[PDB]
Amino acid sequence: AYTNSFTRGVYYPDKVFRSSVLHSTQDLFLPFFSNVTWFHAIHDNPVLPFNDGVYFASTEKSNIIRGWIFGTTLDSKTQSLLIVNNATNVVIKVCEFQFCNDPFLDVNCTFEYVSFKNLREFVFKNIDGYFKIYSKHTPINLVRDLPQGFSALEPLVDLPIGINITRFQTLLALHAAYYVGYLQPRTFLLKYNENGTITDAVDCALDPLSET
Amino acid sequence: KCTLKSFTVEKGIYQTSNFRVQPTESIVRFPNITNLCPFGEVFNATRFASVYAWNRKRISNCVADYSVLYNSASFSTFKCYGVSPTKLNDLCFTNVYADSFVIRGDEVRQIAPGQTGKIADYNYKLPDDFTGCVIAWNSNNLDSKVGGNYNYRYRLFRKSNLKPFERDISTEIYQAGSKPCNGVEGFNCYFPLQSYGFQPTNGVGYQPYRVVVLSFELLHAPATVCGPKKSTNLVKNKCVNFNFNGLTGTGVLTESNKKFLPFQQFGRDIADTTDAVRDPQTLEILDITPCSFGGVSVITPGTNTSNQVAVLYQGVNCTEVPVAWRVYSTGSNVFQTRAGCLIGAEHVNNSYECDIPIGAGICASYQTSQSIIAYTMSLGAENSVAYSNNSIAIPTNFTISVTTEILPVSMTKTSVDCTMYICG
Amino acid sequence: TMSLGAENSVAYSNNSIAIPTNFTISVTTEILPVSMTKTSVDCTMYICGDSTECSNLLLQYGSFCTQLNRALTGIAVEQDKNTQEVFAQVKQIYKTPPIKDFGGFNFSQILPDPSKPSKRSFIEDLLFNKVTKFNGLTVLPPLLTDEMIAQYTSALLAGTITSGWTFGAGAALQIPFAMQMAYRFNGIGVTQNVLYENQKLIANQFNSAIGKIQDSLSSTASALGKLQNVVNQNAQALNTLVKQLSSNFGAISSVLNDILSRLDKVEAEVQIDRLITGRLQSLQTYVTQQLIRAAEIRASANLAATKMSECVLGQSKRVDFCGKGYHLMSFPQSAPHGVVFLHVTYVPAQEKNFTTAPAICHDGKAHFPREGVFVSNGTHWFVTQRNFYEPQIITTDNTFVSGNCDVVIGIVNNTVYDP
Amino acid sequence: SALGKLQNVVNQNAQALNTLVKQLSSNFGAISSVLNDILSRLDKVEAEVQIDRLITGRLQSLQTYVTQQLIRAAEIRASANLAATKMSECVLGQSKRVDFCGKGYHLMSFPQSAPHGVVFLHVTYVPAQEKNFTTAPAICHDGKAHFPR
Ligand SMILES: *[C@@H]1O[C@H](CO)[C@@H](O[C@@H]2O[C@H](CO)[C@@H](O)[C@H](O)[C@H]2NC(C)=O)[C@H](O)[C@H]1NC(C)=O
Ligand SMILES: *[C@@H]1O[C@H](CO)[C@@H](O[C@@H]2O[C@H](CO)[C@@H](O)[C@H](O)[C@H]2NC(C)=O)[C@H](O)[C@H]1NC(C)=O
Ligand SMILES: *[C@@H]1O[C@H](CO)[C@@H](O[C@@H]2O[C@H](CO)[C@@H](O)[C@H](O)[C@H]2NC(C)=O)[C@H](O)[C@H]1NC(C)=O
Ligand SMILES: *[C@@H]1O[C@H](CO)[C@@H](O[C@@H]2O[C@H](CO)[C@@H](O)[C@H](O)[C@H]2NC(C)=O)[C@H](O)[C@H]1NC(C)=O
Ligand SMILES: *[C@@H]1O[C@H](CO)[C@@H](O[C@@H]2O[C@H](CO)[C@@H](O)[C@H](O)[C@H]2NC(C)=O)[C@H](O)[C@H]1NC(C)=O
Ligand SMILES: *[C@@H]1O[C@H](CO)[C@@H](O)[C@H](O)[C@H]1NC(C)=O
Ligand SMILES: *[C@@H]1O[C@H](CO)[C@@H](O)[C@H](O)[C@H]1NC(C)=O
Ligand SMILES: *[C@@H]1O[C@H](CO)[C@@H](O)[C@H](O)[C@H]1NC(C)=O
Ligand SMILES: *[C@@H]1O[C@H](CO)[C@@H](O)[C@H](O)[C@H]1NC(C)=O
Ligand SMILES: *[C@@H]1O[C@H](CO)[C@@H](O)[C@H](O)[C@H]1NC(C)=O
Ligand SMILES: *[C@@H]1O[C@H](CO)[C@@H](O)[C@H](O)[C@H]1NC(C)=O
Ligand SMILES: *[C@@H]1O[C@H](CO)[C@@H](O)[C@H](O)[C@H]1NC(C)=O
Ligand SMILES: *[C@@H]1O[C@H](CO)[C@@H](O)[C@H](O)[C@H]1NC(C)=O
Ligand SMILES: *[C@@H]1O[C@H](CO)[C@@H](O)[C@H](O)[C@H]1NC(C)=O
Ligand SMILES: *[C@@H]1O[C@H](CO)[C@@H](O)[C@H](O)[C@H]1NC(C)=O
Ligand SMILES: *[C@@H]1O[C@H](CO)[C@@H](O)[C@H](O)[C@H]1NC(C)=O
Ligand SMILES: *[C@@H]1O[C@H](CO)[C@@H](O)[C@H](O)[C@H]1NC(C)=O
Questions:
Q1: Quick one: which ligand is closest to A4's CA?
Q2: Helices and strands in chain B, H and E counts
Q3: Atom of ligand 11 at shortest distance to CA of B281?
Q4: Domain positions in chain A
Q5: What is the C-alpha to C-alpha distance for residues C128 and C221, in angstroms, rounded to an integer?
Q6: Are A80 and A163 a contacting pair, CB within 8 Å?
Q7: Which residues in chain B have their CB less than 8 angstroms from residue A128's CB?
Q8: Is the domain A2-212 a CATH 2.60.120.960 member?
């Protein structure tokens, strides 16, 4: 199952303020008007390969999704990234153990850290060996698809974990929709406004006018 | 006089110098952490790991007195790349990593950027622009045990050619056999962990050497590993020298409404140069300018008329150059203009035609009591044609003018024998 | 495949002429650059950023930074000179008369407006509205301010309106404007009674043609393209020179203080020499392209000064030199970095065929026109001036004689009258 | 100071040549400005590194001079074409072109030679001593309009 990304999946590329400038930079970004894989909250939560990095988003009203797992193999042999919001806190850990084996969450792990209408958006990538997370929340009103428009995701964390991620999966509260696409290296044009908000962008490779 | 290589100067306006406001104070601001970095855990641990299994440690959020390591004369090498070794006590970093192991002393060569050989190709590698320090010392007092410390091991071979900072632990036999080796030795089929017999009686290169590689997460981003450094009281709205976390500069530090999101640490200009910082100990967004500067145009009649002189400081206000030359800054009178601050020249309202040009309609001349005067130039005299719908004027006489005009037509023909010029 | 325009066959013969029976005035804009933005750069501050260590090292290159200063100072000074060459030709500030009865012609769009904060015309404000860093770089004022330029375009225009050619050669002489246009018409082979017999039509065409130019200048910025290029190019060259501060040239950083803080001299000075070598080569590149671009403007300034003297101060005979059609008169208007001319020209407008012959025989003698041309309506023979149909009876006044009929190709018989 | 337009061309060439000679004295990062020092001091294997700095520096100084002279010669050539034009139009003729052959109404021009240049003496008529008159564009007599020749 699929739909179209349009111009979703921009994030602040560097820890810097700029304003009133059409600045441009090269990084892993979601390519414009590319397809995305489509899912909804029935039975719908398989393991996925991670590639060079994941754009992930979900449209919810009640937090059906509570977390994610990432790693080589999720196997109780190697320390593997676990992410949860445990209703009181954001929680992050690198467990080997299948203490819960399935994506089901009930209604020695070295590194650890703690802190439809709701569209949650994320970008996950690994560079420096560090796991880098970018985020957004917004109200939405379109039912089937990622809403055609623009919003730049904000950084969260830059975690020293060093994991060979090749696979990942999401985690569900058990006794809404979600979407996936993959980053690629692109040069982007980025529109920093007067208040230093990224307000619009161009995927230069998209078509000959975008190159122009 | 010296600007023109001459003992005599003609009437004009001359460039002579580029003035700059000097820094009034030297600010330092720093990450606020005080806990000393864990160098005892790095350098004085019971064993460093086997060289195929080289250990790694993160250093973060601590104060790094590298003088401690620099004074450790036991270091058979203390080589650094991208930093001169003593500068580590003031330069600072986001994180630093220590890699560590014991090696055969002969093979210490391979612990440098661009190296080749069994370790460099198969079990430890530095990147081509390795930034940081390599430390090694003879450890034959500890890591030799009459050969019986055979725990220290490396690849002879394997076709898995190694990346910089690649960890590996694999014990699989080299599979490249005359037959697929599949757990059984033979031609190319060998176990992947050749060893050092660390005897105290080893030759000085066969002996064990302990190793530390400090590799630096050296970036403009938030520093957390930093040398011991004072943080001063702040100065605002005045020209100062400054340092923030290792970021040097000179400028006016000033208050701002640059609305940094919580992750944004620096403001950048349109040409992407730093123009604001969040103070590391106060978290105010300081907006920043260079300290004030400008050309020093000297205005003079010819020396053959007078030695008396005036100065134009271009672009700057008089209120930002109240310095002290001594006399030619107090000047008895000083006139602000659209071109800059003008000192010593006497302002006058009478609009003569222009003599020495300042700019933006201002000119200067030497005049009566003699002084350099400055005034708004005339455009020429005013006139009013008596136009009326039936009125004509006709000349009743004439005069024949002779008017000179002068044109260049040629310039000196020359040639240069460029081998005789260059090579003599 | 592009078309080179409409295809036309002219109805030529050994005996056919077309003569225009009516005219139109027109007013055509021409725009010229005169003076680009006056820059200056201290190479010592640009290259070395107040590092004394770097500054000492830069002295090994000798007289480079002093000659690059001298070169940009040469360019920067002649921008005032160009602006002096073009506008400051008039030796007095002539001012406009208080009464506007210029025979019905209406200059109120191009004369200065006293309501304005800076004393510009209505049309000069359209021009001014259509036309659109600290690293040891500097930018300098012109000598003449934009308000002073508007005084010279006021003076040139007031002298032209009130006194014709005369204020160029001598002192300005008053003359009624209707007579000034009669003597301009008489300069293009159209007999001056053609103006007086049509003065209200001509004034109505002229006032309407001035009116259309506000609408032209309101319609598009693309008309100002020549001036807008000057602004674009110097801003593009400067931003290229500023971004070059960030380039590595193979040094470990382009922020010079990184080298000076991370490294001691024996390592540092080679890295500093890469940045020096880079920035100095990049600054020679900027200065060299400015010297070439300055000469490109200089030829445009000397062309503008030539049109100012040959057209505004006179009446140019030279085809297409001051507007298409037969040239009558021109008015300057001031603008950002340049000048605008409103050339006024006469265009013949309604063609008619006539039969023609080079000569007439009458008394056994060949007759030729003293001025103008022989023509016939198919029964009668007349003479007319060349540029406007005005048929007159042929007489010994408007003709002169040379020899017997027999030598001329295509002579025709008619009477010639003797009054 | 009338002849500054010629004297400047002499001064600019003197300045350019002196600057071109003086750049022989600059080190360009070699151990000496004088090539015989390196050849008397150093073994060839090291001298070939030092000399490459002097070649690079001296060559960059020479290219700058030649580039500059190409531009300066193009300015003189524009002035020479203009001089040749005033020669044909003002000396061999009489010009209708306002202010081209000197200020006023043009009569005649005489050339005189000068170093690196030419000087013209333009001879021009200039009107003087106005009187006012009343005027009218036409005359009426017998009801006909008469206009002047
Ligand atoms: C990163 O993980 C991947 C698997 O998630 C590793 O590659 C595979 O390793 C298995 C043996 O464990 C091989 O059979 C496969 O052939 C490998 N995959 C491919 C595409 O060849 C990979 O080696 C890991 N790398 C590191 C540095 O940990
Ligand atoms: C010459 O052409 C002009 C138009 O370009 C004619 O002027 C118009 O004449 C008619 C009457 O014939 C008027 O209604 C219009 O208002 C006139 N136009 C203007 C702008 O005033 C003119 O008549 C022609 N001349 C001759 C002799 O035919
Ligand atoms: C000269 O022409 C201008 C327009 O070019 C005339 O200005 C108009 O004047 C009337 C009042 O007479 C106003 O109602 C209009 O609004 C004015 N037009 C504009 C564009 O402002 C002016 O009247 C003419 N003067 C003479 C003496 O002919
Ligand atoms: C050629 O022009 C002449 C003058 O306009 C015309 O001759 C006059 O014609 C009118 C009638 O249209 C007569 O009343 C006059 O007596 C004629 N005058 C003379 C001196 O003969 C002539 O008709 C025109 N011919 C054509 C073919 O148009
Ligand atoms: C022009 O008029 C003359 C008469 O004034 C014509 O001359 C006659 O021409 C014929 C034929 O050549 C001769 O037979 C006569 O002897 C000529 N007479 C005279 C007095 O010369 C002449 O032909 C006319 N030409 C045209 C083209 O009209
Ligand atoms: C996106 O997926 C659809 C199937 O749902 C496919 O038909 C389409 O070709 C894909 N998009 C592009 C741009 O090819
Ligand atoms: C979430 O984890 C924290 C410890 O980090 C714990 O105190 C809290 O009780 C947990 N909440 C739930 C609902 O498990
Ligand atoms: C704990 O993790 C380490 C690696 O981090 C591993 O060596 C060890 O075998 C693990 N122990 C258990 C009980 O899984
Ligand atoms: C900047 O943000 C403020 C609120 O923080 C908003 O009111 C203002 O309109 C914005 N200005 C611009 C130029 O975007
Ligand atoms: C290591 O131990 C010795 C004493 O055995 C001590 O003098 C030295 O300061 C220690 N060095 C570090 C880096 O902790
Ligand atoms: C930094 O430390 C000083 C004392 O050294 C203290 O006064 C100040 O509150 C601290 N600030 C922060 C943000 O830690
Ligand atoms: C220099 O002095 C002489 C007399 O000694 C005088 O004629 C000349 O005008 C003076 N010129 C200047 C520029 O002072
Ligand atoms: C000069 O500085 C003063 C304040 O020191 C300021 O009031 C004034 O407006 C400034 N004038 C100019 C022309 O910069
Ligand atoms: C010059 O003019 C100003 C007003 O513009 C006046 O205050 C001042 O007294 C005048 N000074 C002289 C020397 O005339
Ligand atoms: C002139 O007459 C010829 C007769 O063939 C005709 O072709 C042409 O169009 C006419 N031109 C004008 C200006 O009347
Ligand atoms: C003019 O040309 C016509 C044919 O086009 C011819 O009959 C006639 O003789 C010619 N006349 C002259 C004077 O050339
Ligand atoms: C011509 O007469 C008028 C009368 O008002 C006068 O203004 C003008 O100055 C006189 N011009 C000459 C040249 O006498």
A1: 6
A2: 5, 28
A3: 13
A4: 2-212
A5: 11
A6: yes
A7: 217
A8: yes
